[PDB]
């Protein structure tokens, strides 16, 4: 289909955690989302919301539909359960690498099915509570699923990162490694 | 692997040329089984599984012509309310050229993603050697995009990596 | 400023 | 949005009745929805519309181009038709679908 | 689309509670509208219900009046905690199915209450 812009409703419903997801991306790039817990619409930058507004019964109301759709097909596809498609895991930095510069590093996860991820930072081979943020699941054309998650962290000499993916398709967690 | 089961839809809106194109899928388990499109007029089943479901959906005629009314309503509709904020926005790219023999040129945070990255040593244009890196989503709305070129490093020599984008009124360089 | 949306259909 | 009906109209059996809604502020969002009311029950949808013309075996929906206003054309009217027609302007929201003073349409023999 | 609304006629004393039901017998609704028509006046919307979440109460109502319940995705309810003469009305609820049905925007009202308190 040919299109200067696709603007795409993308919505989900699970089993096992996150049960749900109802987002919008404008050029595969996530501007709102429902959060289905606190029943608002989470804007990523505060200049859409200034501009625009989005009904959040708009979105608990299809996952609703989407549920009952989803015990539906289960039901008439005979409990079939899709295979576990191997997660792709790349490391980057957002801006380039200095020494004393704040900088963000970015865990690209693609191309895995379910969304169902434990993803978590390790600096040194130790765990990194401090600075962490994650993107929502993210759809694909192919109907697979990709994610971000963030680091924002201060390089310096001897630090190494990680990038720990847990995923029912990888039979022990990925680690993705990072140095410069 | 525990028992798990998904459900999933898209609501997809098409610009171009002024038109306005509406697909409505319904896919279960990365299987897209039933279809709207609005090129088509009606529901369509992709897959054995969603024929039963497209039948009943052609049947209750004011959802269709209300689906057939989603490229005016909705795409068109939003389409021309975000205008200002997301078909016009502008983020001048930042670049940087580092040694790292390799001479990498990372440019950072521009947003249209549309972005020209030339090679010049001595102000003639390098082609050979050039390797340049798909265009890569930060997933905060910006681009990123790595030029790599390697060289014959000659003392007095000036490597200078051109830098064209939509947001910027002339060309950004920065040299080596 | 209210943005559109639409109604995914029930399966059965 | 908030639409304007006449408060009530009169006519004869066997006449086409045409009720007309002003809804002047309606956007590239809303939809046209039209109810029917009988005495002692709720109201009850009838017809839709979005720009097209609708037809079906309860009354007909004129929408000019405009879309600023909409003619609820009934067919031959009875005594059975003597009700209450509101019309609602509005999206695919439930943010106040406001259902405003309607038009007691009363058929006479 | 069907929708149940029981009791259908209800009376009672002032400072009685009177508790209203309004299923959804064949579908699922997330928001379930109640209204409120009077002998010789037109409707009027009271408040909006949500699943799991707080009533978009209307212009007019009093939450500690009338206490609204959405227990659950078929279940809708609706108490007039203090009766009072007053209170005597017509109330109806609705439904919308947007998924099922002819119409999205189409609202499935119940059969009404027919209401009357006396001192």
């Known amino acids: 289909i040919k299109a200067d812009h696709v603007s795409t409703y993308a919505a989900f419903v699970q089993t096992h955690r996150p049960t749900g997801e109802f987002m919008f991306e404008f050029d595969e790039d996530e501007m709102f989302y429902v959060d289905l817990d606190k029943k608002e619409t989470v804007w990523h930058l505060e200049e859409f919301g200034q501009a625009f507004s989005f009904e959040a019964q708009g979105g608990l109301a299809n996952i609703a539909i989407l549920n009952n759709n989803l015990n539906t097909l289960i039901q008439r596809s005979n409990h079939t359960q899709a295979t576990n498609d191997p997660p792709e895991v790349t490391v980057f930095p957002k801006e380039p690498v200095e020494l004393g510069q704040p900088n963000t590093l970015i865990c690209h996860i693609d191309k895995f099915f379910p969304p169902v991820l434990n993803v978590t930072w390790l600096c040194n081979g130790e765990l990194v509570t401090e600075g962490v943020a994650e993107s929502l699941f993210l759809p694909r054309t192919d109907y697979s699923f990709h994610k971000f998650h963030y680091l924002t962290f201060v390089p310096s000499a001897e630090d190494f990162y990680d990038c720990r993916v847990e995923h029912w398709g990888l039979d022990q967690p990925l680690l993705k490694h990072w140095e410069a | 692997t525990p028992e798990n089961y998904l459900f999933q839809g898209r609501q997809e809106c098409y610009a171009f040329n002024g038109t306005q194109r509406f697909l409505e899928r319904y896919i279960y388990n990365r299987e897209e089984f039933a279809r709207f499109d609005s090129d088509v007029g009606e529901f369509r089943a992709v897959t054995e599984l969603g024929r039963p479901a497209a039948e009943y959906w052609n049947s209750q005629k004011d959802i269709l012509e209300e689906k057939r009314a989603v490229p005016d309503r909705m795409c068109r509709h939003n389409y021309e309310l975000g205008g200002p904020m997301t078909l016009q926005r502008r983020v001048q790219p930042r670049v940087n050229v580092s040694p790292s023999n390799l001479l990498v040129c990372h440019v950072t945070d521009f947003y249209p993603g549309s972005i020209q990255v030339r090679w010049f040593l001595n102000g003639q244009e390098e082609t050979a050697g050039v390797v340049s890196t798909n265009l890569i989503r930060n997933g905060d709305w910006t681009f990123q995009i790595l030029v790599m070129l390697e060289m014959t490093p000659q003392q007095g020599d000036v490597y200078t990596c051109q830098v064209e984008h939509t947001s910027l009124d002339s060309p950004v360089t920065v040299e080596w | 400023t209210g943005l559109a949306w639409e109604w995914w259909r029930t399966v059965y | 949005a908030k639409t304007t009906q006449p408060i009530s109209m009169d006519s004869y059996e066997g006449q086409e009745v045409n009720i007309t809604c002003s809804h002047n502020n309606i956007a590239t969002n809303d939809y046209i929805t039209w109810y029917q009311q009988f005495p002692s029950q709720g109201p009850r949808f009838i017809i839709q519309g979005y720009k097209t013309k609708v037809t079906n075996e309860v009354a007909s929906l004129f929408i000019p181009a405009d879309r600023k206003s909409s003619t609820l054309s009934l067919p031959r009217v009875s005594l059975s038709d003597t009700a209450v027609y509101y019309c609602?302007?509005?999206?695919?929201?439930?943010?106040?679908?406001?259902f405003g003073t309607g038009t007691r349409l009363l058929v006479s023999p | 689309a069907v929708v149940s609304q029981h009791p259908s006629w209800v009376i009672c004393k002032s400072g009685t509670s009177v508790k209203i039901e309004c299923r959804s017998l064949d579908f699922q609704a997330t928001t379930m509208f109640w209204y409120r028509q009077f002998p010789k006046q037109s409707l009027m919307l009271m408040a909006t219900s949500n699943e799991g979440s707080k009533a978009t109460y209307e212009q007019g109502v009093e939450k500690d009046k009338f206490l609204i319940n959405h227990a659950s995705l078929t279940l809708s309810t609706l108490t007039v905690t203090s009766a009072h003469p007053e209170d005597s009305s017509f109330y109806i609820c609705?439904?919308?199915?947007?998924?099922?049905?002819?119409?999205?925007?189409?609202?499935?009202f119940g059969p009404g209450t027919r209401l009357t308190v006396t001192e």
């Open positions: 609602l302007v509005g999206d695919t929201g439930f943010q106040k679908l406001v």
């Open positions: 609705s439904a919308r199915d947007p998924g099922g049905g002819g119409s999205s925007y189409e609202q499935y």
